[PDB]
Design a protein around this ligand. Structure first.
Ligand SMILES: *C(=O)CCCCCCC
Length: 852
């Protein structure tokens, strides 16, 4: 009573470096059996020249897997390959391995030989202990468990040829029962030692021509082959990708047989199949296809298919499609079950059955081939729908059978709201690793599930995946960056900018994201009573809307909250918050001191209370002087208002002594420009007369002032005084002090640590230059919006991209409506686009490392 699915798969098979190459060979009808000298001189000892072999055994990203080089040279290639294939298989499922660490996830590996362990133990004087650690069969599973921190069962099992499908049947049982949430299931087989082939030849088990002629009259033995295959199973609840569901699996053993231990009992094979179908409530009628063991043997093939005839065809009207992967690539012995499995799932994902090779004349000892009750797939056929069975048998008598219900979910009808641009992250071991995943994005941008899933696997520790990239999909250009990443952890700082960041139609672009639009609608709910709507102000044809002080104050705050609402939804929590002027209202909200209604109302009243009040005229100017040298050369009346950098400082004072300090300053050609303030001298004693009206209004808005965290640095209160009762809370008192006191901005930037990532939360990034000049060189500075820029959603995505690029983990899936998993059938494979760093080349045992 727990539904088990096949979530993810990867492999290397003969002439197939990954499952895309394997699929190309299958649907292409390319024989993957070869007669070159890769493993040993062809014909040696009178052996068949033909065998299925891997393109390469020498490559292993040793350092990603925490394997030191001395250890990698003395590790069974089986394991080196299975670590890579196992990683491949998990992420293929759209599952971040991190999510399975520390869980009771189990590992089961079919493996029948470590030829390598004999090779590397031959010379006592120069052998290495690490060779025990890298070749002992338990490790073919125990190493997987160790690397992935999987704490369920970790078991290497031998039932000869049925071993890997038995591993499937065990992982299945462990998940059906609740013992395990998930399970990695492996099959491995290599042909390093020729003496092993000689054994099989002399037993009469090998076709001289190296061909599994499955189901054919001339079947006279099998072709030995290599395989490395990994499959992730999960309970349905955890799945994103779902190739198929396991309706049922089981194993029996032939037991006693007159004919001998290695004669395959079709009667007992039949017993096994009969036990799994009607008794479990599954009709043979519901099978479209059976993957037979199909080794192409005088005895095996008739025993097997006559079994299939009596157990399944006997209770069917339609013919049963049958096939065997062994025709295509040979028998990879214990890996047979999982090789056969991948052929079945690739066929289903592509909507076409790959055909057998070598099916010329049917085996006349098999009635159901001659009367068409069993119909060999000898030519690509469309997948018409139905369950799938798979057989795997060992020479000792172990039988396994697995029923699959293929996943047939179609993707949903395209919507108008998804014509939005999307953002794709990727991490990687190499530049090519990232470029390839991002190229798969571009190619399949309309596939919501694929992109969603690629985003999930991008969140990775940076010591392991030192290259990151993003790209924006759904936009005219080629928005993409990729780079090396830091290692050291990178604190995230929010800077909420102040005034001068307003512009006509600001935030209209972002109103397509729902978290943003929903923040603006909440903000509108605060100021409905006070007779204004932020949505309508953003929507204003009218050029001078944000010339009204209340319109600007409520809207800049409203948007700063909406941006903080987006960042929060993609998982970004600030380590430090710094405000500038009006900024300190949003900072409050970021820091969780101000509710959203408090923050938005605070901004309205700060505005309304300045409108209503009669204040001594002053002016404000920006001047190319430092904090200090400005105080020196200042008239009386004129005060340094905003300490921005050591380059820029904003002054305030009376309209006369300012429009005289600009001119006396341009004699010396110095940066000096009076700013539009509607004739108010902010951050000075000219604002003192706002305190009575505003302190009352805010007292009624911020009823129960809440503590400010150590993460929010005041720019309104000097550091010396951060311990005061005023600075304790975002009080009505705090927000009045803000308007009449200087902005101690540079003073606070000093406190931003090394390697920090600094985001300017503002509808235009005014403070970029200032921030750069004010914070340490290490620190990365990132804007979120710019005025009159064609698409601001594209600019936001682009800049979220830049955050992911710093090694800070961002998951953009949350910006758009969630994908409904399981992912639709035919979502593209991820396993083939996981590139490694194969720069190094590792020892492989060779024929002469074994005796003669
Ligand atoms: C399948 O039953 C053939 C025998 C498996 C042993 C392979 C490795 C020694």
């Amino acid at each position: 009573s727990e539904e088990v699915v096949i979530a993810g798969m990867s492999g290397k098979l003969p002439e197939s470096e990954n499952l895309q190459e394997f699929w190309a060979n299958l649907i292409g009808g390319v024989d993957m059996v070869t007669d070159d000298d890769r493993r040993w001189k062809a014909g040696l000892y009178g052996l068949p020249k033909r065998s299925g072999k891997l393109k390469d055994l020498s490559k292993f990203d040793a350092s990603f897997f925490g394997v030191h080089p001395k250890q990698a040279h003395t590790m069974d290639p089986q394991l080196r390959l299975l670590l890579e294939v196992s990683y491949e298989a998990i992420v293929d499922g759209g599952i971040n391995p991190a999510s399975l660490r520390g869980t009771n996830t189990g590992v089961w590996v079919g493996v029948s030989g470590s030829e390598a362990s004999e090779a590397l133990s031959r010379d006592p004087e120069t052998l290495l202990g690490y060779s025990m650690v890298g070749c002992q069969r338990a490790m073919m599973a125990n190493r997987l468990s160790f690397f992935f921190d999987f704490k369920g069962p970790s078991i290497a099992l031998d039932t000869a040829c049925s071993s890997s499908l038995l591993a499937l049947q065990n992982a299945y049982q462990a998940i059906r029962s609740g013992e395990c949430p998930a399970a990695l299931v492996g099959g491995i087989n290599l042909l390093l030692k020729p003496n092993t082939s000689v054994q099989f030849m002399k037993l009469g088990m090998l076709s001289p021509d190296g061909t599994c002629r499955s189901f054919d009259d001339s079947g006279s033995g099998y072709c030995r082959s290599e395989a490395v295959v990994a499959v992730l199973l999960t309970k349905k609840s955890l799945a994103r990708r779902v190739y198929a569901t396991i309706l049922n699996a089981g194993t029996n053993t032939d037991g006693s047989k007159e004919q001998g231990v290695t004669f395959p009992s079709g009667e007992v094979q039949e017993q096994l199949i009969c036990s799994l179908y009607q008794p479990a409530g599954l009709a043979p009628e519901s099978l479209e296809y059976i993957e037979a063991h199909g080794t192409g043997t005088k005895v095996g093939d008739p025993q097997e298919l006559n079994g299939i005839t009596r157990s399944l065809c006997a209770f069917r009207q339609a013919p049963l499609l049958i096939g065997s992967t062994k025709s295509n690539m040979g028998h990879p012995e214990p890996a047979s079950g999982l090789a056969a499995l991948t052929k079945v799932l690739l066929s289903l994902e592509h909507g076409v059955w790959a055909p057998n090779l070598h099916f010329h004349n049917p085996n006349p000892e098999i009635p159901a081939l001659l009367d068409g009750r069993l119909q060999v797939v000898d030519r690509p056929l469309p997948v018409r729908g139905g369950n799938v069975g798979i057989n795997s048998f060992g020479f000792g008598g172990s039988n396994v059978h697995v029923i699959l219900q293929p996943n047939t979910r179609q993707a949903p009808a395209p919507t108008a709201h998804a014509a939005l641009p999307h953002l794709l992250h990727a991490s990687g071991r190499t530049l090519e690793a990232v470029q390839d995943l991002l190229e798969q994005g571009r190619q399949h941008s309309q596939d919501l599930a694929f992109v969603s899933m690629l985003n999930d696997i991008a969140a990775t520790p940076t010591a392991a995946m030192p290259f990151r990239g993003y790209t924006v999909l759904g936009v005219e250009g080629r928005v993409q960056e990729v780079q090396q990443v830091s290692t050291n952890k990178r604190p995230l700082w929010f800077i909420c900018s102040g005034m001068g960041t307003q512009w006509r139609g600001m935030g209209l672009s972002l109103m397509r994201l729902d978290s943003f639009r929903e923040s603006i609608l909440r903000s509108d709910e605060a100021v409905k009573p006070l007779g204004v709507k932020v949505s309508d102000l953003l929507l204003s044809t009218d050029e001078r809307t944000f010339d009204d002080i209340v319109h600007a104050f409520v809207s800049l705050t409203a948007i700063q909250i909406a941006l903080i609402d987006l960042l929060t939804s993609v998982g970004l929590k600030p380590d430090g918050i710094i405000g500038h002027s009006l900024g300190e209202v949003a900072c409050g909200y970021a820091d969780g001191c101000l509710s959203q209604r408090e923050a938005v109302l605070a901004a309205y009243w700060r505005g309304q209370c300045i409108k209503d009040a009669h204040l001594p005229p002053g002016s404000m100017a920006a001047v190319g002087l430092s904090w200090e040298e400005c105080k020196q050369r200042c008239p009386a009346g004129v005060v340094p208002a905003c300490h921005n950098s050591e380059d820029t400082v904003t002054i305030s004072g009376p309209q006369a002594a300012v429009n005289e300090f600009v001119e006396q300053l341009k004699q010396e050609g110095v940066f000096a420009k009076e700013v539009r303030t509607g004739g108010l001298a902010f951050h000075s004693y000219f604002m003192e007369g706002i305190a009575p009206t505003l302190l009352q209004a805010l007292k009624k808005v911020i009823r129960e002032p809440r503590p400010r965290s150590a993460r929010w640095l005041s720019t309104s209160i000097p550091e010396a005084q951060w311990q005061s009762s005023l600075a304790r809370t975002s009080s009505a008192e705090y927000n009045v002090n803000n308007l009449v006191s200087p902005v101690l901005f540079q003073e606070a930037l000093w406190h931003i640590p090394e390697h920090a990532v600094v985001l300017e939360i503002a509808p235009h990034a005014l403070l970029q230059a200032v921030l750069k000049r004010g914070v340490k060189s290490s620190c990365t500075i990132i804007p979120l919006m710019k005025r009159d820029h064609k698409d601001n959603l594209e600019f936001f995505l682009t800049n979220l991209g830049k955050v992911h690029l710093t090694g800070i983990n961002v998951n953009p899936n949350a910006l758009f409506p969630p994908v409904e998993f399981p992912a639709p059938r035919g979502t593209p494979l991820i396993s083939p686009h996981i590139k490694w760093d194969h720069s190094q080349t590792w020892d492989v045992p060779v024929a002469e490392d074994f005796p003669n």
